[PDB]
């Protein structure tokens, strides 16, 4: 690419660093999702919450990369580290871990805003609108859940009831759809391949209406 | 977890290795997507294709992890390496790279099937049905695209027309929906937070019908 | 205003006093609402109940002022004192506080009825129909809730389950709509201001039908 | 509450002060509403406008309190002073009073923004988006009304015609709905109380559909 | 352009001159629109009328340029002068100014018709049908408004009532729609840019029906 | 106007200067539109794009003037200069010209934001939200088009295919509606004029429904 100008290089470097931070957070949500789906754990609410969190983090990383590309910069990708701890004694530890991660993300975003505030107004507005609001809302939600868990306790069937309630409230908002793909079903109908005749299909449809 | 039995440990280790391979492929698709979206490249068809491929690979990794968890095993996650090359001279190089990756994936899957064939019939059936068909179909599609590109050439406006056609045929099958999240809009309406009243909303809806 | 006759001045003074009492009750509900919405409390049911109570008290004060104005009197407003206690150890204390406030309101209303009974029949009918019924019903509801809470206990997850149930039953009856306002969105469309062309809009609508 | 951290204490104090300012403005609108509804005044347009203004101010105070609670702070409520003047010679004086109040509110908000600008980006964005826009729009509308009134005059039937027009344009935007409550109607049907069987009702409804 | 023949050069020059006259009239309507929208004027009817007039004049200039291009000529653009007076004592002066401008436009059009009448029949028909009718109708409307204003007077609330009526009658005929544009909302969905995938969208739509 | 206070005079002057800049850009788009519509050029896509750009620039100028009027200032209009060059060798030159103009606009807006940042928070928010986003998006789109054109070439039928595609994608978003006007058709039906009976028509319509 013979064009990487306009955008300030230091801001570009900091943006790429934050992109990698978001990718690491998305990866770490996967480990929690896998941990709580074991046949000896079977906690449906935590599973749904962790899946939703991982998808949200991936979308945030994609959005920041798209913003960097819109201003005319380049994005360089590097190594993604493995999560350190892959087990939790109870729900309180997991919620505390998530709260600490949110605080770290907010600190990084504030540093970015401070860096880009003097020159680029649009960049600072993007930082303070499209990236911070989600973090603030998620932090409030997680803090409320943590307070409720601390009040309820950690023995008996209290955690089970809490998990059922959490699954109910999470499923009312998020539901991941399936990703379509290709297969060898009906081989005799798609001889070269399935996609190559798409245009033709469109013509057929117009003749039906 | 005091339960990790039944599933053969060697098969579990090989399955985890293949999961990491799929995750690496998904990560590498992101670099191509970012490369072809630069303001000095602006190739819409390649962008759509790479986005679709990354989502497909992520779904495949999730499916294999779910199968391991269903049989009673554990999944341990480790480091994801960075892609080596992040630039391509023309479309032919990118398509060749993808074809080679597909061949590597197929070889790994065949080794897995050979390992698990003697004892576990269900595992071998899962390998040969739910994992190989997608790879075979994608390999055929990519080979057809590569042959067409080689016939067309690499100079003039041929690649531009090919890219427009590719975008048209890809968009007829895949369209990634947005992931819902939380925000601070309408603060006075969701005082503790937005999710905590979900159950109440349901009751209201029943009274309306 | 050169007209303040007909209505008995002593009745007018007592009515104004009761209006200020209702306003004070409405203000005190706000403190409870703010207390139970803290991130370290997060009790959704109590929040909904307190919000509903504050709105009900405000409506009652408005109704009494409207009745005074209908009979030809004047309303003079004075200072609203701050609530004394702004913290509660458990739900039982809050419910007891509300019950005591209801008893005080009922005593004041009975005194008003006694004052106005001899001369004005319409005023006494208004007092005994439009002001007392709400208080009686609310007192019964709060007493039932208090008895249930005392039976349940104050330790473990009993209060959490009670709070969830309370939110469910309150939300089935009350939902505060948003108050519309003015903004600077679409500045080029409402040049003087948004309201000044309302009449014109009406004409347009008639031409569409 | 063992948690009041994160939020800067000086910003919290200033926010609470502004909350009390908004509450005072909401209270003062009530006096104007009561003044213009007397049987010797009977100005419908001014009544509607003052009612709308009081509701808007109350909503603004609620929104600021909710924002403070979301960031993890506490809200402490204090005394609300009585309005000073409770009579106006003509509409021009009332409109001038409202304009001056709007200017005072804007100055306070600007001071808040200056205080919180250096450290918290999200707080400053909230101040400049969710609080200032309404004030600017309302100030423009009130200034336009004041200019029209000054041009029209103050004698004859000019003010009366203006009052009809104002009522017409205000009523096209705002309409306060009734607040539901409890009563003793149909006593034999709701024996413990009306709310306690809400869940049961829902089941019945599902069986009807 | 190696083709500028057929069309008579003198007619082309006169047409370009009239195009610039229409553009100047459109520009001058903007100043009146801005003058009557000040917070110390706030005349909604005059604002609507001036906005409509400016749009009409711009459309007329576009139509004349299109006619010149259809016959095979060229259009050369030059400087647009500023309006001389930017204030008016009352509505009568503004209406008189508009009437005088209409008379000037009609004189110019008559000169054009005289110039092109001998040779080109189609050009003269275009002048007498597509350009004069609007001017005649607008002149009649403005003269009627001026007579009504002169009869009404210039003191009291007469002009204000007239302004409401004018706004009502203008708004029943004209309403300028918003012009769509591009933005950075939903950045993650339109990665290269929003327009480049339009064709693909069409295919998707056909598959839905 | 005896009222021009509140708004800072230096900010007002800078705003008026930027308004004139936007008007000049809108005027210059007209010359390109006229150039590409000649019978010896006949490029439909460029014609549509230039028409859309001119309308967008006019709307932006109107929006900035409306914002100045809302804050209580005055707008003074001056002379609009003629465009310098009115011919282009190929599409690349036109796209480069547009990109340079966008860069100039962005620099001016950044200077405005710097000027108004210290005192007025609402003004700076308006600058960074309602004026910069459009420029950023349009710059990205034009850069993508320029890169595609440079890759395609400048000889043969490549530009023709590109122009057809550009027309297709532009027309999917923008379509300028006709501006209604007055005429002398059906003279016997609208005797004084067409508008004067509008109110009566409304009554008739109500009687039909």
Q: How far apart are CA C97 and CA C103, in angstroms?
A: 10
Q: Exposed, middle or buried, A85 (CB in 10 Å: 0-12/13-18/19+)? A: exposed
Query: Do D61 and D23 meet the contact criterion of CB atoms below 8 Å apart?
Result: yes
User: End-to-end CA distance of chain D, in Å?
Assistant: 46
Nearest to E42 among D144, D153, D158 (CB): D144
SS3 of chain A? CCCCCCCCHHHHHHHHHHHHHHHHHHHHHHHHHHHHCCCCCCCHHHHHHHHHHHHHHHHHHHHHHHHHHHCCCCCCCCCECCCCCCCCCCHHHHHHHHHHHHHHHHHHHHHHHHHHCCCCHHHHHHHHHHCHHHHHHHHHHHHHHHHHHHHHCCCCCHHHHHHHHHHHHHHCCCCCCCCCCCCCCCCCCCCCCCHHHHHHHHHHHHHHC
**Chain A interface residues facing chain F, Cβ-Cβ under 8 Å?**
3, 70-72, 119-122, 124-125
Rounded Cα distance, F183 and F193, in Å: 10
Q: What are phi and psi of A155, to 5 degrees?
A: -130, 155
> What is the distance between the alpha carbons of residues B73 and B87, in angstroms, rounded to a whole number?
39
D neighbour chains, 3+ CB pairs within 8 Å: A, B, C, E, F
C-alpha span between C196 and E47 (Å, rounded): 11
F27-32 contact pairs (CB < 8 A, 24+): F27/E77, F27/E80, F27/F54, F27/F80, F27/F83, F28/F83, F28/F101, F29/F53, F29/F54, F29/F57, F30/E77, F30/F54, F31/E77, F31/F83, F31/F86, F32/F88, F32/F94
Distance CA E116, CA E123 (A): 7
Q: Distance between CA atoms of B69 and B75, rounded to whole angstroms?
A: 7
DSSP state of E173: T
Q: Which of F55, F64, F70 has the highest number of chain C CBs within 10 A, making it the mutation to test binding with C?
A: F70
Kindly provide the b/e burial profile for residues B147-167, where b requires at least 16 CB atoms within 10 angstroms of the residue's own CB: eebeeeeeeebebbebbbbbb
- Beta bridge partners, C80, equal D80
CA distance A178 to C109: 63
> Residue C64: in which H helix or E strand, if any?
helix C44-70
* CA-based nearest residue to A198, from D47, C115, E206: E206
Interface probe for E, chosen from F39, F55, F197 (most Cβ of E below 10 Å), is: F39
Q: D35: Cβ–Cβ under 8 A, 6 or more apart, which residues?
A: D41, D86, D87, D88
How far apart are alpha carbons F42 and F47 in whole angstroms? 9
- Looking at chain E, which subunits does it touch, using at least 3 CB pairs closer than 8 Å as the criterion? A, B, C, D, F
Q: Distance (Å, rounded) from C-alpha E55 to C-alpha E39? A: 23
Question: Rounded to whole angstroms, how far apart are CA atoms F63 and F66?
Answer: 5
Separation of CA B54 from chain center: 4
Q: Report how far residue F116's alpha carbon sits from residue F134's, in angstroms, rounded to the nearest whole number.
A: 20
The residue in chain D having the minimum alpha-carbon distance to the alpha carbon of residue F69 is: D140
Distance CA D149, CA E115 (A): 54
Q: At what angle do helices B121-130 and B44-70 cross, to 10 degrees?
A: 170
Q: C-alpha E7: how far from its chain's center?
A: 26
Residues E131 and E26 sit within 8 Å (Cβ to Cβ): no
Which chain A residues have a beta carbon less than 8 Å from that of B80? Answer: 27, 79-80, 82
Buried b (16+ CB within 10 A) or exposed e, D102-125: beebbebbbebbebbbeebbbbbb
The answer to whether C138 and C49 have CB atoms below 8 angstroms apart is no
Rg (C-alpha) for chain E, rounded Å, is 22
Dihedral Cα A51, A107, D122, A91, nearest 10 deg: 40
Kindly report the nearest CA distance between residue B194 and chain F, in angstroms. 27
Q: Work out the burial of residue D207: count CB atoms within 10 Å of its CB; fewer than 13 is exposed, 13-18 middle, 19 or more buried.
A: exposed
Chain E residues with beta carbon closer than 8 angstroms to that of D152: 156-157, 160
Q: Kindly list the residues from chain B whose CB atom is less than 8 angstroms away from the CB atom of residue C171.
A: 197, 200-201, 203-204
Q: Which chain C positions have a beta carbon within 8 Å of E185's beta carbon?
A: none
CA nearest neighbour of C26 among E74, D54, D187 = D54
Helices (H), chain E: 9-36, 44-70, 91-116, 121-130, 132-152, 158-171, 198-208
**C-beta separation of A139 from B16 below 8 A:** no
Q: ∠ at Cα B6 (B2, B7), nearest 5°?
A: 105
**B174 neighbors A198 (Cβ within 8 angstroms):** no
Phi-psi map region of E42: left, alpha, beta (phi>0 left; psi -120 to 50 alpha): left
Q: Identify all chain A residues contacting E184, using CB atoms and an 8 Å cutoff.
A: 67, 70, 126
Give the nearest partner residue to F82 out of E79, E86, E181, using CB atoms: E79
| Å between B54 CA and nearest CA of chain E | 15
Other beta carbons within 10 angstroms of residue E91's beta carbon come to: 21
Q: Which residues contact A191 (CB under 8 A, 6 or more apart)?
A: none
CA distances E129 to E116, E120, F64, F184, Å, are: 14, 15, 38, 11
Please say whether the beta carbons of F66 and F131 come within 8 A: no
CA dihedral of residues E113, E115, E119, E124 (deg, nearest 10): -10
Q: How far does the CA of residue F167 sit from the closest CA of chain B (Å)?
A: 15
Torsion sign (Cα): D92, D95, D101, D102: negative
**Contact pairs from chain A to chain B, CB under 8 Å:** 153
CA distance D140 to D132: 13
Q: What is the C-alpha separation between D91 and D103, in angstroms, rounded?
A: 19
Task: For C22-51, give the DSSP string.
Answer: HHHHHHHHHHHHHHHTSTTT--HHHHHHHH
Total Cβ atoms within 10 A of residue B191: 22
Residues of A in contact with B85 (CB under 8 A): none
Query: What crossing angle do the helices spanning F198-208 and E158-171 adopt, rounded to 10°?
Result: 60
Name the residue of chain A whose CA is nearest to B196's CA: A169
Closest CA to B146 of B80, B81, B95, B200: B95
Helix (H, G, I), strand (E, B) or coil at E80: strand
Residue of C nearest to E174 (CA): C204
Distance CA(B35)–CA(B86), nearest Å, equals 7
F143 with B41: Cβ contact below 8 A: no
Q: Do A122 and F136 touch (CB under 8 A)?
A: yes
Residue of chain A nearest D68, judged by CA positions: A140
Per-residue exposure over E57-90, b if at least 16 CB sit within 10 Å of its own CB, e if not: bbbbbbebbebbbebbbbbebeebeebeeeebee
Residues 6 or more apart whose CB falls under 8 angstroms from that of C81 comprise C24, D79
Q: Give the whole-angstrom CA distance, residue C51 versus residue C173.
A: 13
Report the 10 Å Cβ neighbour count for F66.
20
| B207, C172 contact by CB (below 8 A) | yes
Closest chain B residue to the Cα of C166, Cα to Cα: B200
Q: Which residue of B has its CA nearest to C43?
A: B192
Chain A residues near residue C40 by CB distance under 8 angstroms = 143, 147
Binding residues of C for Fe cation: 22
User: What separation, in Å, do the N-terminal and C-terminal C-alpha atoms of chain A show?
Assistant: 46
Q: Which helix (H) or strand (E) holds D123?
A: helix D121-130
In angstroms, rounded to a whole number, what is the distance separating the alpha carbons of residues E156 and D156? 10
Interface of F with C (CB under 8 A): 59, 62-63, 66-67, 69-70, 126, 130, 198-199, 201-202, 205-206, 209
- From chain D, pick out residues whose CB is under 8 angstroms from the CB of C192: 144
Q: Which residues contact D117 (CB under 8 A, 6 or more apart)?
A: D124
Q: Which of B33, B42, B168 sits opposite E199 (nearest CB)?
A: B168
Could you list the residues of A known to form a binding site for Fe cation, using ranges.
22
Contacts of E153 (CB under 8 A, 6+ apart): E159
Q: Which residues of E touch C (CB under 8 A)?
A: 33, 37, 42-44, 47-48, 51, 164, 167-168, 170-172, 175-176, 178
Contacts of B39 in chain F (CB under 8 A): 140, 143-144, 147
Query: DSSP code of E179?
Result: P
Give the 3-state secondary structure of residue B88: coil
* Residues of chain F neighbouring E27 (CB-CB closer than 8 A): 77, 80
For B159, residues 6+ apart whose C-beta sits below 8 A from its C-beta are: B90, B91, B149, B152, F151
| Nearest-angstrom CA–CA distance, E92 and E103 | 17
List of residues 6+ apart from F36 with CB closer than 8 A:
F43, F46, F47, F50
Q: How many CB pairs under 8 A join C and D?
A: 153
* Phi and psi torsions of F80, nearest 5°: -110, 115
C-alpha torsion sign, points C185, C188, C191, C195 = negative
What is the CA F158 to chain-centroid distance, rounded?
Answer: 29
Do residues F59 and F119 lie in contact, with contact meaning Cβ atoms separated by under 8 Å?
Answer: no
Q: For chain D, how big is the Rg over CA atoms in Å? A: 22
Supply the Cα-derived Rg of chain F in whole angstroms.
22
Four-point Cα dihedral B148, B154, B160, B166, nearest 10: 30
CA angle A53, A55, A57 (to 5 degrees): 70
Q: Give yes or no for a contact between E137 and F193, defined as CB atoms under 8 angstroms apart.
A: yes
Q: Where does residue C177 fall: left (phi above 0), alpha (psi -120 to 50 degrees), or beta otherwise?
A: beta
A187-194 LR contacts (CB < 8 Å, sep 24+): A192/B144, A193/B137, A193/B140, A193/B141, A193/B144, A194/B137, A194/B141
Q: Enumerate the H helices of chain B as residue ranges.
A: 9-36, 44-70, 91-116, 121-130, 132-152, 158-171, 198-208
Residue of C nearest to F129 (CA): C185
Compare all CA atoms of chain D with the CA of E43 and give the residue at the minimum distance.
D148
| Three state DSSP letters for chain F | CCCCCCCCHHHHHHHHHHHHHHHHHHHHHHHHHHHHCCCCCCCHHHHHHHHHHHHHHHHHHHHHHHHHHHCCCCCCCCCECCCCCCCCCCHHHHHHHHHHHHHHHHHHHHHHHHHHCCCCHHHHHHHHHHCHHHHHHHHHHHHHHHHHHHHHCCCCCHHHHHHHHHHHHHHCCCCCCCCCCCCCCCCCCCCCCCHHHHHHHHHHHHHHC
For residues C58 and C62, what is the distance between their CA atoms, to the nearest angstrom? Answer: 6
Query: Is C201 close to E170, i.e. CB distance below 8 A?
Result: no
Angle between helices C91-116 and C44-70 (to 10 degrees): 10
Residue numbers in the known binding site of E are 22
CA B47/CA E191 separation, integer angstroms: 8
CA atoms within 13 A on the CB side of D25: 26
**C-alpha dihedral, D120 to D124 to D126 to D128, nearest 10°:** -170
CA distance E15 to E68: 7
CA distances from C11 to C77, C127, D166 (A): 16, 12, 34
B22 in a labelled binding site: yes
Helix (H) or strand (E) holding D165: helix D158-171
DSSP code per residue over D46-74: HHHHHHHHHHHHHHHHHHHHHHHHHTT--
Residues 6+ apart with CB under 8 A from E183: F133, F134, F137
Answer whether F166's CB lies under 8 Å from C171's CB.
no
Inter-chain CB proximity A143 and C41 less than 8 Å: no
Q: Give CA angle at F199 (F194, F200), nearest 5°.
A: 85
Q: Collapsing DSSP states into helix, strand and coil, what is residue B192?
A: coil
Measured CA angle at D100 (ends D96, D104), to 5 deg = 170
Q: How far apart are CA A127 and CA E67, in angstroms?
A: 50
Nearest residue to B169 (alpha-carbon basis) of B71, B44, B10: B44
The string of DSSP letters for C122-185 reads HHHHHHHHHTHHHHHHHHHHHHHHHHHHHHH-SSTTHHHHHHHHHHHHHHTT--PPPPP----S
**CA-CA distance, C149 to C156, in Å (whole number)?**
13
Please indicate the experimental technique that yielded this structure: cryo-EM
Measure the CA–CA gap between F54 and E77, rounded to whole angstroms: 15
């Amino acid at each position: 690419c013979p064009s990487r100008h306009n955008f300030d290089p230091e801001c570009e470097k900091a943006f790429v660093e934050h992109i990698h931070l978001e990718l690491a957070s998305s990866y770490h949500a996967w480990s929690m999702w896998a941990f709580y789906a074991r046949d000896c754990k079977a906690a449906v609410g935590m599973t749904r919450l962790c899946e939703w969190a991982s998808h949200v983090s991936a979308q945030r990383a994609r959005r920041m990369a798209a913003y960097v590309l819109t201003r005319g910069g380049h994005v360089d990708y590097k190594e993604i580290p493995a999560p350190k701890k892959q087990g939790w004694d109870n729900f309180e530890d997991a919620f505390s871990h998530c709260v600490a991660n949110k605080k770290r993300i907010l600190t990084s975003l504030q540093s970015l805003y401070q860096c880009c505030q003097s020159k680029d107004a649009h960049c600072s507005n993007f930082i303070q609108t499209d990236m911070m609001d989600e973090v603030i809302a998620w932090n409030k939600f997680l803090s409320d859940c943590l307070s409720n868990l601390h009040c309820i306790g950690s023995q008996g069937m209290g955690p089970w009831v809490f998990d059922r309630w959490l699954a109910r409230i999470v499923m009312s908002k998020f539901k991941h759809p399936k990703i379509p793909s290709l297969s060898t079903s009906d081989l005799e109908s798609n001889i070269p391949n399935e996609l190559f005749d798409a245009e033709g299909d469109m013509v057929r449809a117009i003749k039906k209406l």
